[PDB]
Design a protein around this ligand. Sequence first.
Ligand SMILES: [Mn+2]
Ligand SMILES: [Mn+2]
Ligand SMILES: [Mn+2]
Ligand SMILES: [Mn+2]
Ligand SMILES: [Mn+2]
Ligand SMILES: [Mn+2]
Lengths: 301, 301, 301, 301, 301, 301
Amino acid sequence: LSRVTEIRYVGYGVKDFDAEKAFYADVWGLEPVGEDANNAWFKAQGADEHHVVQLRRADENRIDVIALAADSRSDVDALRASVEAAGCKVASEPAVLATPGGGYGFRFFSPDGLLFEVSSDVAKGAKRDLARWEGVPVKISHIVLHSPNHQDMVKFFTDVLGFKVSDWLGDFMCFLRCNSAHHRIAILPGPPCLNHVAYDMLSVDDMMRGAHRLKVKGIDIGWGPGRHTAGNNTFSYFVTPGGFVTEYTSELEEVDFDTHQYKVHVPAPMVMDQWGIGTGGPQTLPHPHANPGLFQTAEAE
Amino acid sequence: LSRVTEIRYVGYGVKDFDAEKAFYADVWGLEPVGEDANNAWFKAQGADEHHVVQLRRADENRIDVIALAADSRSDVDALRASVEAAGCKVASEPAVLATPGGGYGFRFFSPDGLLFEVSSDVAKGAKRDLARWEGVPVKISHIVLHSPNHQDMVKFFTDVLGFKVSDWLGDFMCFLRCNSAHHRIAILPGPPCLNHVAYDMLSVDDMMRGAHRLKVKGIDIGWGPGRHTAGNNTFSYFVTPGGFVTEYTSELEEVDFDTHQYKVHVPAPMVMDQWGIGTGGPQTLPHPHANPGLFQTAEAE
Amino acid sequence: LSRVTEIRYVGYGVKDFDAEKAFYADVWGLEPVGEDANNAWFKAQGADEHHVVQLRRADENRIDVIALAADSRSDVDALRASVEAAGCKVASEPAVLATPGGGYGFRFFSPDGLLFEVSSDVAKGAKRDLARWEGVPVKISHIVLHSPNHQDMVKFFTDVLGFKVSDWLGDFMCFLRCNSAHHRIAILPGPPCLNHVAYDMLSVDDMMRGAHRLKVKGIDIGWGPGRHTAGNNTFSYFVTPGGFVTEYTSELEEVDFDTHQYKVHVPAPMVMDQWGIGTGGPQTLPHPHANPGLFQTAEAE
Amino acid sequence: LSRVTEIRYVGYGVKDFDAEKAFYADVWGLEPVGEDANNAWFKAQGADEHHVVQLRRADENRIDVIALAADSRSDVDALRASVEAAGCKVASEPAVLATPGGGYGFRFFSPDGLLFEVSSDVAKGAKRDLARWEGVPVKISHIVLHSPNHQDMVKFFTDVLGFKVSDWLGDFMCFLRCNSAHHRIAILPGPPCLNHVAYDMLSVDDMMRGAHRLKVKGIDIGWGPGRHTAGNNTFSYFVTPGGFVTEYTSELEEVDFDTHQYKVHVPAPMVMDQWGIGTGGPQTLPHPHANPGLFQTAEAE
Amino acid sequence: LSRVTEIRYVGYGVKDFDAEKAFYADVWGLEPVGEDANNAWFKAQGADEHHVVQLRRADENRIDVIALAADSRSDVDALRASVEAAGCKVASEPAVLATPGGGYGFRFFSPDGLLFEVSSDVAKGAKRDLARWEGVPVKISHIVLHSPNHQDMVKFFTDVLGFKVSDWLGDFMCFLRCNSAHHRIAILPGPPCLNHVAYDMLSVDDMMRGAHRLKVKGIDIGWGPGRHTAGNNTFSYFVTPGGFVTEYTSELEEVDFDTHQYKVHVPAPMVMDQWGIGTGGPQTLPHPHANPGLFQTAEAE
Amino acid sequence: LSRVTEIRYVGYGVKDFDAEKAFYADVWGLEPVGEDANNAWFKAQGADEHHVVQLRRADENRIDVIALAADSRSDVDALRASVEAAGCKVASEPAVLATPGGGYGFRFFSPDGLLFEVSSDVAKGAKRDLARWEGVPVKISHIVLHSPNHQDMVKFFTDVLGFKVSDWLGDFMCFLRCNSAHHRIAILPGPPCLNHVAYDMLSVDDMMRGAHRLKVKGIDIGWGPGRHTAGNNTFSYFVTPGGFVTEYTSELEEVDFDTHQYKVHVPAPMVMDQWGIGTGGPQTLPHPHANPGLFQTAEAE
Ligand SMILES: [Mn+2]
Ligand SMILES: [Mn+2]
Ligand SMILES: [Mn+2]
Ligand SMILES: [Mn+2]
Ligand SMILES: [Mn+2]
Ligand SMILES: [Mn+2]
């Protein structure tokens, strides 16, 4: 049946519009793709996806949209019906998109009130094979979300969107894949919102090199020099000027999308971080707060 | 049936006996109670338990015994009976104790192999009411253990030894009570071993002054001053010279022993620590390793 | 006689008006009450004082005014006379204030040249009983001032304004009260200026939570968490983006305004901080400097 | 009368003899002078004073004696009277010394219970002009004491022992000179005991070099590099493995012993430390405690 | 012949023009000389140099020009020929300057593409003797450059501009003097660019005082207090809000411009910093990146 | 000709015999091979080398010997004559060794006075293929020595011992190989001594897991985890309780012993460390000191 196949971008609503714009292009290593009096689009130098981040000047910080990819026009419609069947509020009907790089798609809110987008045939952008030591994002690695009822959110993603379970951290954190990457989405309990967005680095040396630039650029590592167990990926968390959290990650495991057997890792500090030599932890990072405007569009504000 | 009513003491086998010995009497705040060629006893100044810590000069660091209390001599026998039905290896029949403070007790191995002692009528010692600012322990607060089958270890503590579930952190960490204190035992997953032993302080002020003393003695706080959710107690974890970890804690809740309803807390950063302004994390503390000589007594080595 | 009964607000002239405006509403925990081109008003959520902070957009950082409260028009007129007798430079006569909240007051310069305001019947704002863990200020706790002639500055607060001495730190720091709070004003030797403004928290836990919210906002603790001796209050000092310092405090002793016996505390390490587990110290906060515009109203600039 | 003219040495009773004996010989920079079953003498390489530190294997830490120096054999006698006419218990009648280095002197307890010694003609030891960057002590700089009646205690020092006042920190800390150096003794209120013994370094560079050696050897600065105001000396406090604090100081001002005009400095953060760019503070060093065995010699234990 | 005899100023092209503007005035300690819509000039309070820093609102941070001094209007003409004969691209012919303080000079590019300026007779501005503890720059100390062919860059500076070599750190870093100071210029390997601009402090104390100010102002010492071996000057590096690095330096030796003989220090860990006690290190500072627009003026952009 | 093919072990004369001895078996990860009252041999678990570390109880710390390995008995004699010719002071004539493991070899002093040993047929010990995450050493990676005439000391290793140059850091640090490993020995300017010994780890993960064990053992990283340029090896430096420095390293390049072209890297922060996010640096490690007893065997003492 038709399913989500990748993540496209994350649209942010940010107060400190300018500070956040400079961050992504002069600090985080993303490539500007376009600006407008009220918006800004950036893209990952190592991927052909039109844009991976969208910034909209707003009166408050929030996540406007989480855009997922579908293979074809007939796949976008199938998920359109599937979402309806599951009882979701549909904010838009499948049609050519006026947003950058066009594409055919629709929008619907998740059972929690977070706006999502599913689209196909979105224009492609440039893409080069990065050399080692550049310290810049190759592509998006994953997105982590909080949910008031995570078990159900996990099922929506599996039964409606087509994700499959790759791992479990006890019974509170689930890792979901929609292709051969260990996971592209991770669901966690808490108020309906987004926790962080990770970016894939070419190598461990690159994550370090990037973390280094971020340090001199005045941003310290919120939780760094670590390596997770579920997915076995190295990590480095940061807080953007806008107050969001972004992560440089690397070496996430490749699996067989169709046959990977998930495991239930037993919680333990060593399980969250197998290195235990960096600084900070999940406590030095912002505390989750319900995303402003649940079931509301960026417009409605 | 009858049940365990309190914790008496923990017996440690230590490699650097001399250094460990000087730690408890001159840094930690315990009162020397007795000594000999290969052993040393210590008691908390604010409680009349004959002694709360016993050290044995050994070749390898380990836990020799976790000593528990029972109200009566026939309570000790009832517990000998329970253990038998649970199928535990009994190391001693209920008899008069030759250990300091005497008493009537027996020893049995928990399903994982750690050695426990259940006894009653142990000679009381000297006790006095501490004054704010002394910065010394009042009595032992709790003991946390790791178990390869933590669900079973919990049922053992509740069904065999009569403890009761006071709280849960997900499905991986359980808090058990044997009296009005929120807990005296907490089970956690991992190889069969003892995580740490906590000592109750008179006030948050005494934990701070205590932590201060340790700091000037050369011992840094392993997990900065904080406050847990389950039990609402403040904490300060330290590593001893023998490599064991001890914690100064305060304000542990009081509950009705029978009517207290337990809760399942959702794992979250701010759940392990509601303050989040100290240094360290469980990661700066030793990784759990199986206790040397499972199902073996001190004689074994 | 007639006297000052409490603190109202503190008016600041800030060069970086926007960063300071954002600091109070999004980090410090105060409630915005009004804004115009060159001004911003903030209120403490746990008190009905119309506003506790006023910020004026300025070319240079300074303290524009420290407003105090009196019980009634009569009391204010009386104090106004008292001020004259003590030979002070009066900047206005008892009249209906035109600032937000209204009221009946007048302004005058302390013997040192700092502008103070005494007023009565200022409108009452809304007030809320905070819940533990919110980490936001309940009310203004105290204000510390520097005076070239502290011995005299104290006499002026006691004899003209009615404040009474609650304690002395050796012979250089005096704590003064004007109600049941140990103190609302403290006098320290140094150029004529304002040292810090302290905000009272519901509990020590709340102080810690506030400190944590600030840590994730990127504002480190200037003088780590501690507990003072005089007044027995816990403290957490911070440097605002505007350059001033603010403090989260709690557990400030309550005393009988009339019969409280003051003590002279002998200066010592353990006297400034009875905990000694945090970081920083007075040596790590900005050095006091004469307040710009002595004996000059904010107009003058 | 005649007067004390210089500090000779300090004698400590240390529980952890070995550790401390190692400290001074390899880490601190003092050259050994002679050993024995329970005694170790140490010398400062840049001064002819036979030995500046005496260690005695004891059960609990304590100050056994603070050895001072007199010029002639008869100046001693002239003091033995002053002490008598002061009412001090005398522990030794002027007699030829049986302690390493010989000499003639007596022992008596001061008004607070700390044993002092006054001698003359002790055998000089070797001395070489140290070179910049060696990072070892040149001689002892000063000793700071704690007194329950510091005002009287100072008068004892000035009137009975012949010291003069050089500076006052408010009314709680008095600097006393017995020669050219700004001070060799400083008095602080508190339980009767020694606070720290400070050694002089050839320069600021040597202090840092010195601190650098202590750091690599595992001893962190208790009170970071700073510059005191009273005396204008750079500082660096440390904690010996025995629980005693020592200091590497430099650039202590020289004054005319006779005419030096003393000043009363106003207490202030910037006063204790004019640099304020390091870590620690009195806060992070041992809290004072009554010296064990008041009015008792070491032979009493 | 005629030769450069001093450094005048550095002109930066800054993106966050206002943040950098405020840094030099409010934080770094320079004095505003003038401004217009797109430029700001700053002056050292301790040097008659008209100005030592120029900022220009730019799209991207870069070095716009490095201004040098010549003694006479004919020296400038001479250097204008030497530069020509060396193959340097001349950006302007020797004439009266239209920049503040005027003067007579011209602009040419060094062999690597950095725009330089040589001038004479520039108007002197205010000047005064700083007092110990003021914590502000006296004048400019030195400027460090990165060159892809530093051996050639060194020869350019000596054979063309008239600089002399005062020292070598191995064979990768050169120290050049234009007057009595050990060096005003230092060449290092790497892409063509400016490493840092260092400001002279009255004394080591001032550097500490200065650094403490940046500390409370929210700027951490990028490379802790230390002392270099070449020049023996104490150092403290910082990262400006603009992204450039500036250092407070003191005690840089003096030398006989004519006779001084250069040494070749053997690299060694402890040669870069003879104290090795401060925090950070060259690793916490930005990595050298070719100055944007080599061989192009600020206009082209 | 016949040449050195590997590093066997290092013998240290350590004053704190018991601490250093505990270090290697309970902290560093080496396995005890032998013991008596004043000696202790240690073995690396991933190599069959009989023992790689030797401790000798001593009055002063020093490098007793640096034992190299030759392929055969004849090979050994060849080198014995080859050493004879270079003019070294032989200390033993080729012959069966009474030391653990036996073998045939001799000891001679290098031009700088360090005592070396070249033996063959030393008894092989047990070896295990470690699994990822054990965090224990596999083998000895390299040894770094200081030389007052480093240039000649290199020719000695290449022309006399048979090593080959794999790289140079500027003209001060040389990297020598005796097989396919990028290097096994590194020479650096300085007083004749041993800088540090490095231990190869199975992977970067194991070094991190190793550094974590040392952290919880109270032994912090002297030079934060990083990555060298020459050899591309990841690093982690530590100071042992005895005062020596050990390094956990990984990913050192494998090269072709014969056809490997070396390079001269230009010194520069990013070259010493390509990551730049750990702590400390060469400066936070002990200063090199001439080795006690130059040209003298352990027996002299
Ligand atoms: Mn992640
Ligand atoms: Mn605990
Ligand atoms: Mn305060
Ligand atoms: Mn001192
Ligand atoms: Mn410099
Ligand atoms: Mn190495």
